[PDB]
């Protein structure tokens, strides 16, 4: 049995996705076929209800000099983070000399707006190649992990932060207690720690098991985040559901008692309770539906091949490593994957070794079908790929069900 990373409680497994590769490792075709693998399985703590993986991948295996995800590759996300930055400039960052720290700034998708407002800030970005892209934009960035000690160092030299923000980062960090002790050291007494990450309620409702992989250690809910804050000196004082990345919640933590929670917190807590979101039976039902999607997806991809139809994929997502490796889906069924990220092109996907080609290569003559791994970006991708569909090309989705359209 594994100990909960939040409270030390016991974690009960409910889904085992088997042996998996690093999701963001893209190999050159000529590289030795040797990969780090680990067991990906997910459990729920008995005491605090935190849904979490049962085996940690060490941070430095995932995040380092060549980490390939470039946030600013999606226009929807550029706009989503610009808007969030302007909202913070209008509310939490209005004093004399405000200071915002972002955990996991990546290429500077959010902090660019803060920098262009002349607000003092610092991005933590331990993946140095994307850090350098943020620094090219004028952003102040430290190429370190946020944790207790690096938070203390920033408090020492920069003073308190009015906002600490983390998007698609806190749930990557098993050492969430260290991060919380760092937020406690660094946050102003009237500041907020705000984070947004894939939401358990969405994962369960959409059976989007691809949101489960090495970099998503936690699948947060309002119930577990409320517990986590409380256990650590903070309080959950707002929630906002976001449509990005398949469904997220943005959580606002304050020092306990310093602000009164919005009605939104209790409403979401009560909906989670009402729908038995984190009950083990629900979480098992979700696991059973994950297997049903596997079996339906592979039967379709097999039938397409038997009927002489070409199939490729669209989006070399981190997410897709779970799909191809759990389902057994390799270049015999999905010939290539198209992606706009230069450092993933002319590479093979992890585990399954499907070749990745630039999206500019997805063009007449089109394949019959494209398996949409970037299904959280459907609207943005399809708007750019209307010629494909007008030609008769069709999308295969596996969220929330296997279907073609
Ligand atoms: N302890 C830590 N502190 C700060 N950044 C971290 C971290 N562990 C991982 N990261 C960074 O967290 C990032 C997660 S990817 C998400 C990036 C971006 N905020 C977005 O929403 O698109 C990677 O860039 C990774 O290097
Ligand atoms: C929005 C968009 C993304 N992509 C690619 C870039 C990324 O490698 C991938 C989308 O990944 P994303 O869904 O953002 O994250 P993850 O890697 O966590 O699953 O799809 C395109 O090729 N075209 C596009 O229009
Ligand atoms: Zn716990």
């Amino acid at each position: 049995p594994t100990a909960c990373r939040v409270c030390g409680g016991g974690v009960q497994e409910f889904l085992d996705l088997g042996r998996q590769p690093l999701s963001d490792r893209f190999r050159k075709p000529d590289e030795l076929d040797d990969e780090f693998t680990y067991r990906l399985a997910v459990g729920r703590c008995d005491s605090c209800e935190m849904v979490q993986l049962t085996e940690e991948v060490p941070r430095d295996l995932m995040f380092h000099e060549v980490y390939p995800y470039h946030s600013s590759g999606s226009s929807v996300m550029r706009e989503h983070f610009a808007m969030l930055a302007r909202d913070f400039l209008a509310t939490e960052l209005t004093g004399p000399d405000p200071f915002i720290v972002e955990i996991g700034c990546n290429d500077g998708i959010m902090l660019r707006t803060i920098q262009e407002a002349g607000v003092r800030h610092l991005g933590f970005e331990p993946s140095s190649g994307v850090a350098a892209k943020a620094r090219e934009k004028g952003i102040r960035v430290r190429t370190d992990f946020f944790e207790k000690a690096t938070a203390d160092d920033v408090r020492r030299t920069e003073g308190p932060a009015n906002v600490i923000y983390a998007a698609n980062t806190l749930c990557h960090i098993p050492y969430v207690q260290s991060v919380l002790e760092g937020v406690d050291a660094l946050l102003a007494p009237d500041g907020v720690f705000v984070f947004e990450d894939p939401y358990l309620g969405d994962i369960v409702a959409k059976t989007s098991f691809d949101q489960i992989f090495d970099e998503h250690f936690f699948l947060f809910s309002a119930t577990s985040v409320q517990g986590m804050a409380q256990r650590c000196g903070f309080e959950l004082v707002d929630v906002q559901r976001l449509p990005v990345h398949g469904g997220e919640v943005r959580y606002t933590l304050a020092r306990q008692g310093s602000r009164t929670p919005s009605a939104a917190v209790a409403q979401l807590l009560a909906a989670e309770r009402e729908q038995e979101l984190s009950d083990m039976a629900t979480l098992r039902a979700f696991a059973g539906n994950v297997v049903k999607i596997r079996d339906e997806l592979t039967a379709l991809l097999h039938r397409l091949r038997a009927e002489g139809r070409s199939v490729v994929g669209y989006g070399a997502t981190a997410k897709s490593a779970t799909v191809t490796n759990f389902c057994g889906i390799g270049p015999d069924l999905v010939h290539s994957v198209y992606d706009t990220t230069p450092d993933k092109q002319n590479r093979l996907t992890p585990g399954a070794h499907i070749p990745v080609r630039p999206a500019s290569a997805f063009s007449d003559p089109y394949p019959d079908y494209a398996l949409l791994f970037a299904w959280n970006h459907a609207e943005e991708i399809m708007a750019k790929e209307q010629e494909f569909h007008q030609a008769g090309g069709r999308w295969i989705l596996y969220v929330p069900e296997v279907h073609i359209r």
Side-chain angles (χ1 to χ4, degrees), residues 89-351:
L89 286 162
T91 55
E92 298 287 349
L93 292 174
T94 49
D97 202 20
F99 182 32
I100 181 169
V101 171
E102 172 169 28
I103 304 172
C105 65
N106 196 269
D107 63 24
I109 194 164
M110 190 280 282
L111 277 175
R112 98 133 58 222
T113 298
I114 293 309
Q115 188 274 159
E116 286 174 354
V119 164
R120 275 204 295 131
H121 63 273
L122 178 62
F124 278 85
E125 188 40 87
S127 295
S128 77
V130 291
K133 302 265 173 175
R135 292 201 180 106
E136 277 162 22
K137 302 160 186 203
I139 307 162
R140 197 174 160 200
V141 183
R142 204 178 151 137
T143 300
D144 276 297
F145 297 100
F146 191 97
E147 53 176 85
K148 159 60 137 77
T150 54
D152 282 330
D153 193 54
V154 173
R155 175 61 185 261
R156 199 191 58 96
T157 56
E158 330 288 318
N162 297 92
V163 174
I164 303 185
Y165 179 67
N168 305 304
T169 300
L170 194 71
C171 74
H172 294 34
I173 289 170
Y175 49 96
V176 75
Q177 291 186 67
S178 178
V179 171
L180 291 167
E181 286 185 321
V183 169
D184 189 44
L186 176 67
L187 187 72
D190 66 344
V192 285
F193 175 39
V194 171
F195 57 88
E196 63 191 62
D197 288 276
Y199 176 43
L200 182 69
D202 298 290
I203 288 170
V204 172
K206 304 182 179 176
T207 321
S208 45
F209 71 97
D210 75 350
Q211 291 285 354
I212 302 162
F213 58 99
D214 57 354
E215 293 173 36
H216 283 182
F217 193 80
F218 296 111
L219 307 185
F220 291 135
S221 69
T223 303
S224 66
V225 170
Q226 180 181 61
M228 180 179 62
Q230 184 276 134
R231 280 158 165 96
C232 286
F234 294 94
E235 168 174 33
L236 181 67
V237 304
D238 209 354
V239 292
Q240 196 193 149
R241 296 198 61 179
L242 313 169
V244 299
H245 293 297
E248 299 200 344
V249 163
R250 182 178 295 149
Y251 301 94
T252 304
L253 267 48
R255 296 160 178 313
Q256 42 100 23
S258 77
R259 300 191 183 198
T260 284
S262 62
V265 185
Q267 281 170 0
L268 197 55
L269 285 173
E272 289 185 0
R273 215 211 163 183
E274 218 277 333
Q275 322 306 155
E276 319 187 69
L277 179 66
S278 299
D279 190 285
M280 280 304 289
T282 297
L283 295 179
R284 280 190 202 265
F286 158 76
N289 291 321
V290 169
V291 167
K292 178 177 162 195
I293 292 174
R294 176 192 73 186
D295 289 353
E296 302 182 13
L297 183 56
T298 57
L300 177 61
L301 294 172
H302 288 83
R303 174 164 183 197
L304 290 172
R305 173 171 75 165
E307 305 272 35
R309 297 310 210 280
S310 45
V311 184
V312 300
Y314 201 116
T317 57
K319 292 190 296 294
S320 68
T322 292
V323 180
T324 56
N325 291 284
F326 181 68
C327 292
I329 288 158
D332 304 333
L333 287 178
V334 176
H335 74 74
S336 297
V337 181
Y338 295 98
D339 195 84
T340 46
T341 319
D343 294 333
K344 296 183 181 182
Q345 292 158 5
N346 193 38
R347 309 290 215 292
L348 305 183
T349 67

